[PDB]
Design a protein around this motif. Structure first.
Motif, PDB file in Angstrom:
ATOM      1  N   UNK A  15       0.828  -1.231   0.000  1.00  0.00           N
ATOM      2  CA  UNK A  15       0.000   0.000   0.000  1.00  0.00           C
ATOM      3  C   UNK A  15       0.867   1.289   0.000  1.00  0.00           C
ATOM      4  N   UNK A  16       2.088   1.208   0.591  1.00  0.00           N
ATOM      5  CA  UNK A  16       3.023   2.349   0.712  1.00  0.00           C
ATOM      6  C   UNK A  16       3.424   2.867  -0.677  1.00  0.00           C
ATOM      7  N   UNK A  17       3.866   1.932  -1.539  1.00  0.00           N
ATOM      8  CA  UNK A  17       4.202   2.223  -2.937  1.00  0.00           C
ATOM      9  C   UNK A  17       2.950   2.590  -3.730  1.00  0.00           C
ATOM     10  N   UNK A  18       1.847   1.847  -3.472  1.00  0.00           N
ATOM     11  CA  UNK A  18       0.562   2.024  -4.177  1.00  0.00           C
ATOM     12  C   UNK A  18       0.102   3.492  -4.186  1.00  0.00           C
ATOM     13  N   UNK A  19       0.163   4.124  -3.005  1.00  0.00           N
ATOM     14  CA  UNK A  19      -0.231   5.529  -2.809  1.00  0.00           C
ATOM     15  C   UNK A  19       0.637   6.481  -3.655  1.00  0.00           C
ATOM     16  N   UNK A  20       1.964   6.322  -3.531  1.00  0.00           N
ATOM     17  CA  UNK A  20       2.963   7.220  -4.148  1.00  0.00           C
ATOM     18  C   UNK A  20       2.948   7.148  -5.690  1.00  0.00           C
ATOM     19  N   UNK A  21       2.699   5.936  -6.220  1.00  0.00           N
ATOM     20  CA  UNK A  21       2.598   5.682  -7.667  1.00  0.00           C
ATOM     21  C   UNK A  21       1.337   6.363  -8.235  1.00  0.00           C
ATOM     22  N   UNK A  22       0.206   6.205  -7.511  1.00  0.00           N
ATOM     23  CA  UNK A  22      -1.074   6.827  -7.877  1.00  0.00           C
ATOM     24  C   UNK A  22      -0.946   8.369  -7.881  1.00  0.00           C
ATOM     25  N   UNK A  23      -0.263   8.937  -6.861  1.00  0.00           N
ATOM     26  CA  UNK A  23       0.002  10.403  -6.758  1.00  0.00           C
ATOM     27  C   UNK A  23       0.794  10.923  -7.970  1.00  0.00           C
ATOM     28  N   UNK A  24       1.830  10.150  -8.351  1.00  0.00           N
ATOM     29  CA  UNK A  24       2.690  10.442  -9.513  1.00  0.00           C
ATOM     30  C   UNK A  24       1.846  10.512 -10.799  1.00  0.00           C
ATOM     31  N   UNK A  25       0.868   9.595 -10.898  1.00  0.00           N
ATOM     32  CA  UNK A  25      -0.084   9.543 -12.009  1.00  0.00           C
ATOM     33  C   UNK A  25      -0.985  10.785 -12.010  1.00  0.00           C
ATOM     34  N   UNK A  26      -1.623  11.059 -10.846  1.00  0.00           N
ATOM     35  CA  UNK A  26      -2.619  12.140 -10.691  1.00  0.00           C
ATOM     36  C   UNK A  26      -2.041  13.472 -11.163  1.00  0.00           C
ATOM     37  N   UNK A  27      -0.797  13.748 -10.735  1.00  0.00           N
ATOM     38  CA  UNK A  27      -0.109  15.023 -11.000  1.00  0.00           C
ATOM     39  C   UNK A  27       0.333  15.137 -12.471  1.00  0.00           C
ATOM     40  N   UNK A  28       0.813  14.018 -13.053  1.00  0.00           N
ATOM     41  CA  UNK A  28       1.267  13.973 -14.466  1.00  0.00           C
ATOM     42  C   UNK A  28       0.083  14.037 -15.448  1.00  0.00           C
ATOM     43  N   UNK A  29      -1.096  13.571 -15.004  1.00  0.00           N
ATOM     44  CA  UNK A  29      -2.351  13.700 -15.764  1.00  0.00           C
ATOM     45  C   UNK A  29      -2.938  15.111 -15.553  1.00  0.00           C
ATOM     46  N   UNK A  30      -2.807  15.618 -14.306  1.00  0.00           N
ATOM     47  CA  UNK A  30      -3.434  16.882 -13.853  1.00  0.00           C
ATOM     48  C   UNK A  30      -2.916  18.080 -14.645  1.00  0.00           C
ATOM     49  N   UNK A  31      -1.583  18.166 -14.751  1.00  0.00           N
ATOM     50  CA  UNK A  31      -0.885  19.234 -15.496  1.00  0.00           C
ATOM     51  C   UNK A  31      -1.348  19.292 -16.973  1.00  0.00           C
TER      52      UNK A  31
END
Length: 112
Positions: A15-31
């Motif tokens: 779950x530790x990696x799961x969160x950080x990977x999803x965040x990386x996605x959200x921000x790269x899609x968000x921009x």
């Protein structure tokens, strides 16, 4: 302008990696979404748990349909990138906002 949330409950071994990977996605899609949909603002809320991450994406947009598009961009990328580190990552998508204001009290009888 309406706001729509989608609560994706992600069961993952790490779950530790799961969160950080999803965040990386959200921000790269968000921009990218701020350029394609300048009306649509993305907000993120993740909270980890014993083998789970509760993802809540809040997309404030003109229409929840165009916001569903944005949610799908996030869905494809989070699922792909997460499984590349942890194949145990199964995502369960539930829409947290059920688009109300359906009942239009349109009262009109104009005398002519």
């Amino acid at each position: 302008m309406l706001t729509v949330e989608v609560e994706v409950k992600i069961t993952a071994d790490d779950e530790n990696k799961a969160e950080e990977i999803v965040k990386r996605v959200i921000d790269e899609v968000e921009r990218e979404v701020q350029k394609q949909y300048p009306n649509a603002t993305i907000t993120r809320t993740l909270t980890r748990d014993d083998g789970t991450v509760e993802l809540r994406i809040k997309v404030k947009a003109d229409t929840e349909e165009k916001a569903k598009s944005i949610i799908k961009l996030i869905e494809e990328r989070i699922e792909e990138e997460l499984r590349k580190r942890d194949p145990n990552a199964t995502i369960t998508r539930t829409v947290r906002t059920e688009v109300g204001s359906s009942w239009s009290l349109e009262h009109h009888h104009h005398h002519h």
